[model samples]
Target: GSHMASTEEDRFSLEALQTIHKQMDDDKDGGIEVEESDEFIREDMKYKDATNKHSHLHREDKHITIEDLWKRWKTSEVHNWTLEDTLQWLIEFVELPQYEKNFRDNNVKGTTLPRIAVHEPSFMISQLKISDRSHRQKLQLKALDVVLFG
Candidate 1:
């Protein structure tokens, strides 16, 4: 008589057999270990550091340093501040010396840019005309100022 392995459900569960097989396969394959001193690890750390630095640059709102001011001007957040707010902030935060240097570097000669010229004069005048009509209609009701201003 030959001896054979028992196929008892209690002694050898399907889950247990799978686990045993996995262990055996791992042992057969030459289990590779990751080293802490790898160049890939160093590169990953550098990338993480750079990402953190940029994140810091993005959220920096306290200081009025040159880099911080430039970042604020370049980056726009939705519903955070108006275009006016950004322009005013730039005028306030940017240092006089750096501002002068930037102005000279990007020097605008002779004729003003048509886009910028339209912003203050034409666009504002058109808005003022519309506002005057709105104001006149409101004045007739006596509560127009309260309704519009408030």
Candidate 2:
């Protein structure tokens, strides 16, 4: 219930997520034991205590596993993403703050981006009111990159 309310999950490629998980397995034991858990979270001082105390990773005792990483990444990716994710991509990655409100108003998702790409000009100019050609080009390229590579 409330357990699903955490924002710890963010967009990450499966390969990168796997490597991070493997790196945490300090003993190469296919798991993150107590020492490894504390050590890994040590560098980030603010979350060090909070992570050990209340992180979902440490919810089932203080150990972590490759399986959990898979579960974490897979569940979100499985659904593609929500409108918030699309808005975050717009503001954060594409660095287009001006058109983000339009997207938020329309409740856009990654899947919605592909449809916009189909009729790029009309959508950019008419729907989103992206007046500048440079802004439109930047958005199209970044959105295409996500659609194609991911």
Candidate 3:
């Protein structure tokens, strides 16, 4: 009978594991952020931005508001709005004053909100740091409106 559990080692490529680990460790001290909440949100936005098929060449900045977005979307399409346009909506429509900087800093796209709010709501919730249940519901409801009417 050969039953020996004295010394056993898992056989995985140490180099490969270290390479993966290094990417996770920002300081490269062999330690990674245990909770990937913010990191996941950043990656999610980047991933969505990459998949955007059309790239508009227009650079004219239109200082817009909720009314402006409403009228613009009414005449054309919601998907056509720019990042700046979305920032206004974040402040004007959503009215989450505290998260205005967070949204702009993260470049939370107007179109992306409609998509993530419904698909992966936790992404938006965590990204914006919405701890209150009412605020979370408020965000979800507003996002629904944008998706349905924007």
Candidate 4:
């Protein structure tokens, strides 16, 4: 029982888990059968690899000053950022639509776009979110527990 687990009774009237385990790898060509995956998660392997890389790459936030980032831009403060300045604050404010396009675009999800969005809602220069910040300062000692990292 050292490495045992359970699903439920009648859950495996047959060798269901084993059957799936084999099907998941039936080809040994080393890929999920694709069709099998749209219904169930396959290749839990790649998930951990990519996420591990991304999780630690970017760094750290605030309140009204979040709005001030744009004000600084309009007041002739572009191209003046250093890596250090970028991280300590900014990134949290840059993101929306879970991507880009934010409070000013009146694209705040699900919530009907307010008739008026804040003045400096979102800004990107050469495509880097001016707000994207330093990862080490933000996540200092944080290592993520991804799918395969038990």
Top lDDT model:
2
Task: Write model 3 residue lDDT over 66-126, tens digit each, in one string.
Answer: 2333343445444455667766776687666776676556655554444333322334455
User: Candidate 1 regions off by >4 Å?
Assistant: 1-52, 55-81, 96-150
TM-score of each: 0.15, 0.40, 0.40, 0.15
Q: Candidate 2: TM-score?
A: 0.40
Q: How high is the CA lDDT of each candidate model?
A: 0.25, 0.49, 0.41, 0.25
Candidate 2 residues lying further than 4 Å off, grouped into runs, are 1-79, 118-124
Model 4, poorest ten-residue lDDT window?
139-148
In model 3, where do residues sit more than 4 Å from their true spots?
1-76, 117-121, 130-135
Worst 10 residues of 3 by lDDT: 50-59
lDDT of 2 by residue, 1-150 (tens): 632323212222333334444445666476767566555445422222325332544566455566654554344442376778877877786787877888777666554444333222324445565446765565555543343223
In candidate 1, what are the lDDT values of residues 37-146, reduced to their tens digit?
Answer: 12222342232342333234323321223222223323423113344432333344322232322323343211011111111121111222242433222221211111
Ranking by TM-score: 2, 3, 1, 4
Give residue 86's lDDT in candidate 3 (0 to 100). Answer: 64
Residues 79-135 of candidate 4: C-alpha lDDT, one tens digit per residue = 232333223223342222243233224222211111111122212222334434332
